[PDB]
Design a protein around this nucleic acid. Structure first.
Lengths: 164, 87, 601
RNA sequence: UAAUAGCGCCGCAAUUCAUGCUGCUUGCAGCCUCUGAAUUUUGUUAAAUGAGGGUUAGUUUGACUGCAGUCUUGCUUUCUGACCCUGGUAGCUGCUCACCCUGAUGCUGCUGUCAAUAGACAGGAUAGGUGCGCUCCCAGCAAUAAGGGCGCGGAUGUACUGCUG
């Protein structure tokens, strides 16, 4: 039997602005889970495999974010900060990257998917929508395991040099 | 769809250089040429429900290319709208 | 009791073209008078609350449109046809909306009331037995039981002891010892939540749309969308939803609600003819098969009999009741009045055919008119009464008509009809005082020589559904289905069931209270599918497609109507009862008829 | 060559009774010669169902009067028969395709002759697989379900059937 221990997971701390797709992706590498495995563990079923693709057509409800909060140990109000604010239209087709800031914080920021964002203000640089050398489109942010282009294997931190 | 000569004629007039095969001004000029020829047929053969699918795609593509060009460069957008007689 | 018969009308172009021009011009105030209530009218939400249109409002919107430069060219009877149709469009639509509002409330009460056994213990602060004892007291007080229990829950909250009334209601107005599975309860409570959601999605219905023949909105939208740039995705889709819309090719029919507003005659050639009030220049010739001619001769004989008798007989007993004049769609090319086909549909009360049946309608109207006059007891009201008193005296003067003794059945012999998915009908004839089944029929007997047609219907539905899919992917216009075959099979069964009822001298035919089976199944399969594909909504919809589709194709309302019509033409009473959930198709039919007999008192 | 399986129908072989068949006890006994329900089985020049697309104001199902005599109309549909075709050039128009892998409610599948090019000519609803059919299965193709791989120019502030025709 257990040596008097409370039930646990490899919890992770969220970064200052990462997207819910990227955060769930990290959580299911810190713990070795499949997307449907994490959805099953949370009790919300196949829902998680939409959110990793930014398929928020029906948006994440309060009850679904609370279910994930019970697994990932982040409250529903901090999970909501990893999604667009009410009426801020995002686009989920082109995944986009600053890359200059990815050296300061290795994450996909939610703000790069807003229809209103075209340049990163911390660095005053145009946002990328494909690998600057091989023109490949980026994988969904849950899959950013290596932090580099999947085709030509160029680090995202080096794409700082090739933009604007 | 357009004849070979008609495409070559349209890309040579909206292309900014001999290199433009498909800048946003060339792509909107080819969709505009198609839409005009398609409105002259689809208003006559009102029963042709396979051509309404073609028109509604082709108009919706033009609008996306125009909205992109509007934000990218308003001067290029204004000149393109004039040259195509759009409002 | 009513039936509709039909004939094509033939007349030289000038007459078929002049009538088309009046109907293409009349079709337009049929649209403007819907818009004058669709958006213009300020009281509209008061009508949606009451469920009924005020009896004069459409006439008060039409009266000033009679002088409109666009609408002024039409006879007084074509405006009454417009007022009729628009009255019936809203008088239907408001009555659809009111029953949906009533169902949404009538289940919103139940979703609050439906509690698990553990929730009743928490909400009462007491034992589930204390709840069983109070439920036994409530039945003792009560002894319309279900209605009384809902009243006793609305009123009489009684320190939350009405929780025991909810315990009766969820148990079907009975005591239960068993304590329920929370998974079965979760499925049950979820079905109610799904029905509430779907009723709101339905209650938010579209307003009535008129038949715009002009294409003007479509042509304006085409030249807009091709020459201009939308400012929004919503505007670009608003133009798409217009451009995809198929426009109507036929005007609304004329409705002539007064039987005398059709005048009949015999042509020199011996053919029958007709003309309409306000169109008395345009003679039309009747063309119909001899299988229906006897009514069109009767129309002219009813008219001649009144005219030969100085109006001392009333059209209150004319065999014709009302006519609907409609253009049926033709094929190929030509002007609309040369391409389409004038068809006159006559409503006929079939029991006016015979003298013994005419006497029923004489007594029915004489009682209704006597009551109306005594309920009235105004200016023009004085003339309305004189018209009613004059109908009440004239209706006693008989037309010379065919004689046939009325059918009479045994008050103890009933035909039970059981409907289902696999067996569309199955029949048990019961002598209810003997408790003896006189006969049973399964489908192979109940339409005999025609039993190949059920297998044909299932082949044709399956074959044609696949061809329609293949055709849609290619944009072919060829789109066909088994609907007329299903209509024929439902009529073969309706004749055979009533022939069997006559054979055994049955006093009545018994039909099940099936109700809204389609919506019930749709919520049951969804509450279940949500447990097997959680979060994967596309998998939930795919769960039992063939079962849900077969229930949406199940023609039970059309078979129930087909039997009603043929039974009432024969004179056999229709009765109803609860259809058993378990037993064979025969046992269902047996217990259904016996239940309807037990409900006599 | 292949199509073994699965699913839906069609009868055929049985078994069990009745809504049936002999009696009078008007409710029992008795069996399956019929007419019917239920289960199981089967694919034997058994039997029965059997969707390539089209064609007639077609015939019969009708009304009235004592089963005989009068009158009769050509409407809207479902089958069974029979016959015909398996198309022609003159414009307009949608979709699809750089090139590959997976192969979809994807397309194609008859007889004979000439070519053995991908197509003509002459027959034809027997027309890939079984008693008969399918979204199933076999064979060929697969750009015109979808996903993934990925070459060279334009564009590259999110647009990109936008190029390779």
């Amino acid at each position: 039997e257990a040596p008097d221990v409370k039930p646990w997971l490899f919890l992770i701390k969220p970064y200052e602005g990462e997207s819910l797709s990227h955060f769930l992706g990290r959580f299911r590498r810190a713990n070795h889970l499949s997307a449907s495995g994490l959805g099953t563990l949370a009790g919300i079923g196949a829902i998680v495999a939409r959110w990793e693709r930014f398929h928020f057509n029906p948006r994440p409800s309060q009850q679904e974010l609370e279910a994930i909060a019970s697994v990932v140990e982040v409250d529903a109000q901090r999970l909501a900060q990893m999604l667009p604010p009410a009426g801020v239209g995002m686009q989920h087709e082109p995944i986009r990257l600053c890359g200059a800031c990815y050296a300061e914080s290795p994450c996909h920021r939610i703000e790069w998917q807003y229809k209103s964002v075209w340049k990163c203000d911390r660095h005053q640089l145009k946002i990328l929508a494909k690998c600057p050398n091989c023109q490949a489109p980026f994988k969904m942010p849950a899959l950013w395991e290596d932090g580099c282009c999947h085709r030509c294997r160029m680090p995202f931190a080096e794409m700082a040099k090739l933009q604007k | 769809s357009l004849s070979t000569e008609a495409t070559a004629k349209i890309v040579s007039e909206f292309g900014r250089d001999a290199n433009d095969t498909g800048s946003t001004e060339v792509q909107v000029a080819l969709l505009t040429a198609q839409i005009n020829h398609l409105q002259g047929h689809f208003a006559e053969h009102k029963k042709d429900h396979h051509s309404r699918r073609g028109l509604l795609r082709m108009v919706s593509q033009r609008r996306k290319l125009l909205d992109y060009l509007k934000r990218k460069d308003v001067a290029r957008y204004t000149q393109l709208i004039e040259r195509l007689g759009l409002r | 009791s009513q039936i509709t018969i039909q004939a094509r009308l033939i007349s030289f172009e000038s007459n078929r073209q002049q009538l088309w021009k009046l109907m293409a011009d009349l079709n337009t105030p049929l649209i403007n008078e819907l818009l004058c209530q669709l958006g213009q009218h300020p009281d509209f939400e008061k009508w949606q609350q009451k469920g009924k249109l005020p009896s004069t409002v459409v006439s008060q919107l039409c009266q000033p449109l009679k002088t409109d430069p666009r609408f002024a060219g039409q006879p007084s009877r074509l405006y009454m046809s417009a007022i009729h149709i628009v009255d019936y469009i809203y008088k239907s639509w408001l009555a659809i909306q009111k029953r949906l509002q009533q169902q949404l409330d009538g289940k919103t009460r139940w979703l609050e009331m439906l509690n698990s056994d553990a929730e009743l213990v928490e909400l009462s602060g007491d034992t589930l037995e204390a709840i069983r004892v109070k439920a036994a007291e409530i039945l003792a007080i009560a002894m319309s039981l279900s209605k009384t229990l809902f009243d006793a829950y609305q009123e009489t909250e009684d320190i939350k002891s009405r929780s025991a009334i909810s315990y009766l209601l969820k148990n079907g107005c009975k005591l239960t010892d068993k304590e329920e599975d929370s998974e079965k309860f979760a499925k049950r409570r979820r079905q109610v939540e799904i029905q509430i959601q779907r009723l709101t999605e339905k209650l938010i219905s579209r307003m009535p749309k008129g038949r715009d023949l002009t294409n003007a909105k479509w042509l304006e939208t085409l030249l807009t969308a091709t020459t201009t740039v939308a400012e929004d995705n919503a505007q670009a889709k608003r133009w798409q939803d217009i451009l995809l819309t198929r426009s109507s090719s036929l005007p609304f029919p004329l409705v002539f609600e007064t039987n005398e507003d059709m005048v009949w005659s015999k042509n020199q050639k011996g053919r029958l003819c007709v003309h309409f009030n306000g169109l008395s220049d345009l003679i039309f010739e009747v063309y119909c098969g001899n299988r229906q001619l006897h009514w069109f001769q009767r129309f002219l004989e009813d008219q001649q009999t009144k005219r030969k008798s100085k109006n001392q007989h009333s059209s209150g007993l004319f065999t014709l009741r009302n006519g609907h004049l409609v253009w049926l769609e033709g094929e190929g090319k030509g002007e609309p009045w040369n391409l389409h086909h004038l068809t006159l549909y006559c409503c006929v009360d079939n029991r006016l055919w015979t003298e013994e049946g005419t006497e029923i309608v004489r007594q029915e109207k004489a009682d209704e008119i006597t009551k109306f006059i005594t309920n009235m007891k105004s200016d023009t009201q004085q003339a309305l009464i004189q018209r009613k008193q004059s109908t009440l005296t004239r209706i006693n003067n008989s037309f010379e008509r065919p004689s046939q003794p009325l059918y009479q059945g045994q008050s103890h012999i009933l035909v039970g009809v059981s409907l289902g998915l696999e067996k569309p009908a199955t029949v048990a004839v019961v002598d209810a005082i003997a408790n003896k089944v006189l006969a049973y029929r399964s489908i192979k007997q109940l339409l005999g020589d025609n039993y190949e047609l059920l297998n044909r219907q299932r082949r044709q539905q399956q074959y044609l559904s696949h061809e329609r899919h293949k055709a849609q992917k290619n944009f072919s216009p060829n789109q066909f289905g088994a609907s007329e075959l299903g209509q024929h099979i439902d009529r073969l069964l309706a004749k055979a069931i009533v022939a069997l009822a006559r054979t055994y001298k049955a006093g009545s035919i018994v039909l099940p209270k099936l109700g809204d089976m389609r919506e019930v199944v749709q919520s049951e399969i969804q509450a279940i599918a949500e447990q097997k594909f959680p979060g994967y909504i596309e998998g939930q919809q795919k769960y039992a497609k063939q079962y849900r589709v077969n229930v949406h194709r199940w023609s039970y309302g059309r078979l129930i109507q087909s039997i009603q019509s043929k039974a009432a033409q024969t004179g056999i009473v229709i009765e109803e009862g609860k259809q058993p959930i378990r037993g064979s198709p025969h046992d269902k039919a047996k217990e259904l008829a016996l239940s309807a007999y037990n409900l006599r008192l």
